[PDB]
Amino acid sequence: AAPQVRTSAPGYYRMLLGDFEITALSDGTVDLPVDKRLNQPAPKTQSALAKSFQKAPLETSVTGYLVNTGSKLVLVDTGAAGLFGPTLGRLAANLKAAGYQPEQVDEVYLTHMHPDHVGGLMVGEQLAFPNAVVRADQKEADFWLSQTNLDKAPDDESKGFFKGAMASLNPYVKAGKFKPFSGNTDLVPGIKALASHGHTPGHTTYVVESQGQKLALLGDLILVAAVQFDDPSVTTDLDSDSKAVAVERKKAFADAAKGGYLIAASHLSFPGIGHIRAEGKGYRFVPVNYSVVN
Amino acid sequence: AAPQVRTSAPGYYRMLLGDFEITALSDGTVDLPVDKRLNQPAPKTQSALAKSFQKAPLETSVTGYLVNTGSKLVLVDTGAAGLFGPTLGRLAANLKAAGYQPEQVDEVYLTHMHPDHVGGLMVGEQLAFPNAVVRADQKEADFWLSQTNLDKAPDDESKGFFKGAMASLNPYVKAGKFKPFSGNTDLVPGIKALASHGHTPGHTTYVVESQGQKLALLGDLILVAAVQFDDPSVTTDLDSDSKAVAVERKKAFADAAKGGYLIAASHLSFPGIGHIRAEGKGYRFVPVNYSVVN
Ligand SMILES: [Zn+2]
Ligand SMILES: [Zn+2]
Ligand SMILES: [Zn+2]
Ligand SMILES: [Zn+2]
């Protein structure tokens, strides 16, 4: 007779990294036809999913990462807001439930400008982080914010990716709040941009370092853990440069396994944080041990 | 900027299982000298922990599991309250964060009577679940509630175990609220007791099943994931019967890998829920995919 509550706990996850505080912020999840996206036979993807006890369209987390360096509050990726269906757009509420207000964010860094990463930049026609400067790679902005690329896009879904980027960033560009970088660049003390182009022309990894503790925020360098850890060579039809993304993925996996530091990625099962170990033909992902933060 | 919150999310995790609602409830974490407790050379244990990127004082979570069948509210294990140091005892508050009150709990099932599972039966020196019947195996109660085993215990660590169990259950015994079972027993519709004796003389697994979806609450059949998934035969000095616990753990692992259903265990990294598959001489735990519950 006790009612079922049936609400997930607030989607934020707290982790110390040296003297910095990290908060994975969930935007929700969305079901993706990953077998149709991956560049390999659908039964092969089907089987890899089933080995990890997944199938059919796959419920995929969408996550952004809040870094409090003690002097700046930085958000890496912003979820989708309302751009990508009604199951997403939760990052704003989870930012507040994690004890921060959007106005308190100093900078927003974008791994890339796909809709599930930039949508959160806007709430209606108002800036969602009115106090922040938005940073991403020059090559990312130059590709996605190009009117000519939009009008030449050969389908409504592609056009929609361009429109979503424009609707999400151009308010900041026009307000003088967009500050691009090019390639490997020191950002806020404690965070650097690391070029990992190929999923998109300007796709960027954000590397957080404090007191010798490292965390590489890989954005969309990996999209389907149950396939691409074992086989980092499998790509998707959403990658701008397949061979580049395979190179940059293998690079990040080998470097993280050698150094033994944490990685995170937007679409690993929330909170999406853990270590990586070279195993057999590929890699094994080891989710971070639950730790209470006081 | 912002001052760092450094406060973890509430320790509850919501998961649907058929028509039932499951809530993993965190009691906190505690650092354990697993290298001194496991029955194997320390070189082996350091190796395994480092393989999983872990050190030695393993920060170990302590979890209880709430089952709302829609008709009954059942709690499986209760954390340590104040019996096992100041980092545990979070379960009461996290049950409340999960949308429930202690008065709503109809039945409490104990995998076994160690302090980090029975402590939460008592708040202050007063009943934490005033409307609940408490169930455990008869062998469990007969062993831990024995005044003579207390007075006969070799060390004061074991003496504390007996005293903790007495202090936690005897109030319910005197209120007429302890209803033991013996071995495999159909409890509340949807929940079965399965005998998994050997960590304790009456350690019991609780098998939850709704609309064909199964979840096996293993209690303490595994204590150190970084060791005992790859080598289920390794036991600890805390296990009453090492041969029995080896056999029962291997049986649970083989059965869940055959059946492909979910398991949960008290000291796997919170929430401690996932699938299991055979890998080599042992097994590889696959944490449940994050899913949003509405
Ligand atoms: Zn993307
Ligand atoms: Zn994405
Ligand atoms: Zn135990
Ligand atoms: Zn225990």
- Chain B CA closest to residue A270: B290
Q: Which amino acid is at B180?
A: P
Amino acid making up residue B113? M
B122 CB contacts (<8 Å, ≥6 apart)?
B81, B128, B167, B168, B171
Rounded CA gap, A88 and B246, in Å? 44
Q: Are A252 and A238 in contact (CB under 8 A)?
A: no
Distance B116 CA to ligand 4 centre (A): 5
Whether A59 sits inside 8 A of B291 (CB atoms) is yes
> Which CB contacts under 8 angstroms, 24+ apart, belong to B44-48?
B44/B227, B45/B224, B45/B227, B48/B224, B48/B226, B48/B227, B48/B230, B48/B231
What are the Cα distances from residue B202, in Å, to B136, B167, B199, B205? Answer: 8, 19, 8, 10
Whether the bond between B130 and the residue before it is cis, its omega within 30 degrees of 0, is no
Is A275 annotated as ligand-binding?
A: no
Tokens of A97: 């439930």
Domain count, chain B: 1
DSSP letter (8 states) at residue B62:
E
**CB-based contacts of A155, cutoff 8 Å, min separation 6:** none
Residue B286 to residue B275: CA distance in whole angstroms: 5
B3 is a domain residue: no
Q: Which residues of A touch B47 (CB under 8 A)?
A: none
- Per the CB < 8 A criterion, the answer to whether A194 and A207 are in contact is yes
The values of phi and psi at residue B46, to 5°, are: -55, -45
Angle CA(A145)–CA(A151)–CA(A157) in degrees, nearest 5? 80
Q: Which residue type sits at A249?
A: R
In 3D space, the residue among B76, B88, B93 whose CA is nearest the CA of residue B10 turns out to be B93
In a domain, A5, yes or no: no
Residue B4 covered by a domain? no
Name every chain A residue with its beta carbon within 8 A of the beta carbon of B282: none
Interface test with B, best of A27, A53, A66 (most B CBs within 10 A): A53
Contacts of B237 (CB under 8 A, 6+ apart): B37, B39
Which has the closest alpha carbon to A92: A67, A117, A121, A115? Answer: A121
Answer whether residue B63 is part of any domain. yes
Kind of pairing, strands A213-217 and A262-264? parallel
Residue B89 to residue B246: CA distance in whole angstroms = 29
Residue of B262, B269, B292, B294 to mutate, testing the A interface (most A Cβ within 10 Å of its Cβ): B292
Sort residue B15 into left (φ over 0), alpha (ψ -120 to 50) or beta: beta
Residues of A in contact with B97 (CB under 8 A): 9
In a domain, B81, yes or no: yes
Q: How far apart are CA B231 and CA A233, in angstroms?
A: 31
Q: How many CB atoms lie within 10 A of CB B158?
A: 14
Tell me which residue has tokens 């492909």: B260
Q: What are the residues whose beta carbons fall under 8 Å from the beta carbon of A9, sequence distance 6 or more?
A: B9, B10, B12, B13, B14, B97, B98
Distance from CA of B17 to the nearest CA of A (A): 11
Amino acid at B211: Q
Q: Where are the beta strands (DSSP E) in chain B?
A: 12-17, 20-33, 57-68, 73-76, 107-109, 122-123, 126-127, 133-135, 185-186, 191-195, 204-210, 213-217, 262-264, 273-279, 282-287
Q: Do A4 and B70 touch (CB under 8 A)?
A: yes
Structure tokens at A41: 């036979």
- The answer to whether A55 and B275 are in contact (CB under 8 A) is no
Whether A294 is covered by a domain: the verdict is no
What method was applied to determine this entry?
A: X-ray
Q: How far is B294 from chain A (nearest CA, A)?
A: 5
| CB-CB under 8 Å, B9 with A21 | no
Q: How far is the CA of A190 from the centre of ligand 3 (A)?
A: 42
Reduce the DSSP state of residue B245 to 3 states and report it.
Answer: helix
Contact B53 A286 (CB under 8 A): yes
> Residue B47, CB half-sphere, CA atoms under 13 Å: how many?
8
Query: Range of A187's domain?
Result: 12-287
Which domain CATH number covers A138?
A: 3.60.15.10
Q: Please tell me whether residue A194 adopts helix, strand or coil conformation.
A: strand
From A1, A7, A277, residue closest to B14, measured CB to CB: A7
What is the rounded CA–CA span in Å between residue B52 and residue A285?
Answer: 10
Residue A63 in contact with residue A27, Cβ under 8 Å?
A: yes
**Residue A216 near residue A263, CB atoms below 8 Å:** yes
Q: CA dist B252 to A107, B140, B178, B208, B219, Å?
A: 49, 20, 27, 14, 11
- Residue B83: burial class (beta carbons within 10 Å; 0-12, 13-18, 19+): buried
Residues of A in contact with B29 (CB under 8 A): 290-292
